[PDB]
Design a binder for this molecule. Sequence first.
Ligand SMILES: [Zn+2]
Lengths: 998, 34, 50, 116, 49
Amino acid sequence: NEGISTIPGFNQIQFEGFCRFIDQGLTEELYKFPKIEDTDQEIEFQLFVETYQLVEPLIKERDAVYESLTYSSELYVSAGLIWKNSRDMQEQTIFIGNIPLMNSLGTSIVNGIYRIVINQILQSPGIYYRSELDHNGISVYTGTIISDWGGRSELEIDRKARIWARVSRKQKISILVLSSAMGLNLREILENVCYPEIFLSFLFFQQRCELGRIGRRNMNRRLNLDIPQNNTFLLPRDILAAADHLIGLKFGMGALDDMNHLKNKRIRSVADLLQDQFGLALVRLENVVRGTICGAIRHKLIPTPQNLVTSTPLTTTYESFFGLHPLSQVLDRTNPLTQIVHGRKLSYLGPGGLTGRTASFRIRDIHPSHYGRICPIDTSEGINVGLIGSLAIHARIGHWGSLESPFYEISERSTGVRMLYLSPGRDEYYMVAAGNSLALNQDIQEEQVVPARYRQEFLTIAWEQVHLRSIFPFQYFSIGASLIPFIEHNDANRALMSSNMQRQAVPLSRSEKCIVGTGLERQAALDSGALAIAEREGRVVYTNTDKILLAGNGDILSIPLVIYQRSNKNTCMHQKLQVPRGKCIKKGQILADGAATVGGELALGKNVLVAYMPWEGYNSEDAVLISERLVYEDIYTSFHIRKYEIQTHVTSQGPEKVTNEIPHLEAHLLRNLDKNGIVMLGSWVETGDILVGKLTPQSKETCLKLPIGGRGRVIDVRWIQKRGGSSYNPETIRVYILQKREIKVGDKVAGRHGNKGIISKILPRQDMPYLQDGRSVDMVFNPLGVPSRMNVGQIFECSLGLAGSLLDRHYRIAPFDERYEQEASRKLVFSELYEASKQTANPWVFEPEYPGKSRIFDGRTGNPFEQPVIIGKPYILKLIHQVDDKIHGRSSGHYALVTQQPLRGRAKQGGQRVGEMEVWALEGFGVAHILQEMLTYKSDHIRARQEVLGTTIIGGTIPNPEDAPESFRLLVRELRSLALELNHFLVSEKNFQINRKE
Amino acid sequence: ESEEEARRKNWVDRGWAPWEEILSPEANFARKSL
Amino acid sequence: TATSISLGIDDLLTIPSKGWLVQDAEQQSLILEKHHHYGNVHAVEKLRQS
Amino acid sequence: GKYVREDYLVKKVSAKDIQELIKGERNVPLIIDFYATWCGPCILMAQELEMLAVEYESNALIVKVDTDDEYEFARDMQVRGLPTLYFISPDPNKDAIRTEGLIPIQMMRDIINNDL
Amino acid sequence: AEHVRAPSNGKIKFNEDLVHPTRTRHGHPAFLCSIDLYVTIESEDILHN
DNA sequence: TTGT
DNA sequence: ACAACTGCGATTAC
RNA sequence: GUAAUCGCA
Ligand SMILES: [Zn+2]
């Protein structure tokens, strides 16, 4: 009913999954709970499943995220306990536990953390019929039956009939024996099966037969069976049929099954995981009920139903699931695009799925079945390549667990038009043509030829024979790839790089829309969740920075805005009002604009003038030369907020005490602290200052200091008293600093077309090359990247952007504009440039001799360059990786307790690692002393290291260490714990004496 | 079984008959050359 | 830096005989498809030829 | 409709409903809109009617009639084409105003304020 | 498998008795060649062999 | 898994 | 039974 | 101090 005439919601998948869960999965799980009766009198407690009612959360989301509490709902079910002596059943409602609730965006709040549930792709239960060719002889044919639990009832055939099951570890097993054990009398078996001559010539249980509803259906499909859907059990007729098909495969009457086909796979959504978690929680609850009944019998007391049930199992189960499950990950909130793209991921790796190493090559390639249902250019780069992928824009999840795609039906009928979400297996038996119909050759139009898809193949057929047509432009891609303008002119390899780099953008202090776009930024910003959308019609009577008042139908609703908040990836979140006071807004329109969004469209970068030429080497490899205008005009300024927290953990000996007056500290510090041991709001701090001062008696000084690189204003501090832990808990003090970061040498910039670079010099505007207009270019890029990485759409974008800037237009172009004609992008770009040149009379914009190229001058000398250069205004983004974060340096500070090597990590102030591939290079160069120094006194030799500082301060020569490092000594100790000795035992060549080194 | 018995069974049960195939020159050349 | 080489849209020059070649190739492909529908050639010959 | 607000505020009335509304007494101006799912221009007219209904919460009544469901009634109302709007005044002596084609929202506001 | 291409537009003249008829792998008819032959592309101004 |  | 790139950095969970 | 997960080149 929805998504067949417009782009569906990006978060509709999680929405419908959570809805189906709450609708049916809770009741289905509550139905299967057993009747607790563990006694001689058989005192029985029961839960009335019909009286299942969830309750609204006691706290709001804005309070859960603030107080680090979970956002859940209360499950109340009426229960009846029939006592043995009372001979009656008292009925009361019990609080089983809390069930987490999902937001409209798909995210859940557990312990104050935003977490998303990534979907998993698992093979569907069924019969599979693979084959394998033997080294010598005929090819072996095998049929595997897959169960919901994961049972494998294999069947094999040798050169003879030899219908042997591979269930047993032994050589083989008799299929006739299995059929006789099933119930067959050895006569009806041969009577029912086809080709009975072959069968007659040849002369644990619950989990294998636990076929799902899906399993039943599939079994019926492959092996024609009329077994009702309800009977989801491995019937012997199914086995008989399986055998029949297997023998038939030997004579050529069969078709093997492709296990990479989607129709053979199921998708597990948040509902499937929540249902299993609820079942496990119910099992734990039944165990706890049995235990408390056993205890009440020991204490000679018949208790009320409330006394039996405790709220622990449900809460602890859901908490452990959200905390430790491999398919529950924290939401990435670097930019609004990440929030939406995170919930569309489909993963092969997971609990019950292929591990990175396990996955065969075949698993990781596109299968023709993935067309329109999965993204063919969005994967995870690394060892898990081809195992983590996204979900198509127009896809939906089906009733049977299969992803479905929208296909138009061009076949003539009563309606003559349909949009059907065909499942993966069904679209194979259809002629799907993605081409247009704008061709006439003096014959009827239906006689024209067009490429089409049939039986997982490509072929050319007449328009009379095509049943389906793929009209939607964004049907075969995902949100990440669809945001790439002119994607047809870019290589498929660079598309993945561009999709990955769009995810890294940092929201800037100011936002500007893109001149050239694909038109998906609107719905992206709509479904991102960082936008204020009204839920009621009315008028905006009052406008304020903190809140917005919307008066409608005699009711006033207040919407709270976000003012300089902090995301999970240290990126600022802020919202600004868009609508003025006194205008009407419908239910759905935009009230305010969040970060990285202006005018309701996603805006992850800026539009700057760009020239493609080499400049004095500053552009070698990939490197960008940028002007100072981007610096002193705050074009790429961004705000980053980092949090630091230390809990006041109360030890058994003494609790921690927070005092401002702490001795043994210099007077230059502690200025920011208040009367209480905490920094004040609005205080500028730097590296090595004290944020929270604690006496820590148990006295000492476990304080909070700033690390290297932390220089920002203290925006807010929170004193968080922790409760609900069944006992007094430590208070938490969270400080927040805001670091304004400008664009600097070493920062990464990127373009939507896969172009990435690192700034190398900030030249002034006077030295920058200027156009014939007189304006200096903002950035200069290397023109040799285009033939290397094969990105041609960037040129188009630059030019169209120049044209737009001059004519004050914004172009939202759907991909694959060459379906209309040939060189449609080129025609559009050249036409818009000419118009700009005519309207604003700048002849330079369109040069008839070389369209799209102009001749610029040098800022230094003032002489024109020989060849023309490309001048445009592309959309450049600033990436999260920044130099400040990557800078690091260690002299001699801290060591590991056991290894005694220097520590790891930039935050921990640790050195760099000399691996085996570097020791090899050092040995090849022949630098023995450098290797020895690095392996002993710069790393592990405690005495030598202690002496190094003294020798360097005094200035004396550092002697060569002769003792063994701590790593070797450790080995000796370990090996001798393993009862193995190790002695150096050096022998002097002078006097032939053995000397042990300890 | 034998080709004669199989052809007789086809003629009797399945309705086989050696109907004349009026081929084009290219079709006849393809049938003869292959 | 002095010469300032650059690459543009019109700078990607195709050989002046791509259109004729692609046109005759697709014409032969269509003729072969028509004759395959007639029965003069079989599938493997069409695949090899294309 | 207490928890979730309705997305669309204009209701599809039948011909008998319009006859009863015209026959009865009204204290607010009435606006009748004939539409058809098929006409393209009507997609825009509906958006402007939604905006007008939001701007006039309870000071005017806005209803829509589908020409496909009531063709004879629309023909009897002398409706030439689809983007047609009927402006019924509250006082029953004044004359109704019929507008055809896409008209600006400010024109509708001025008509409702002055003509009706 | 090198493919010989016509140097210019013109008529092809050769003696068909030396070549043997055969069927190409593409289903097309062709002449098999087993001995050195000379074919002439007869154009407006020049002849090619 | 894949092969040793 | 054994092994299947090198390192780095970030987060949360124990 | 160890895991899980993602990213980086
Ligand atoms: Zn294009």
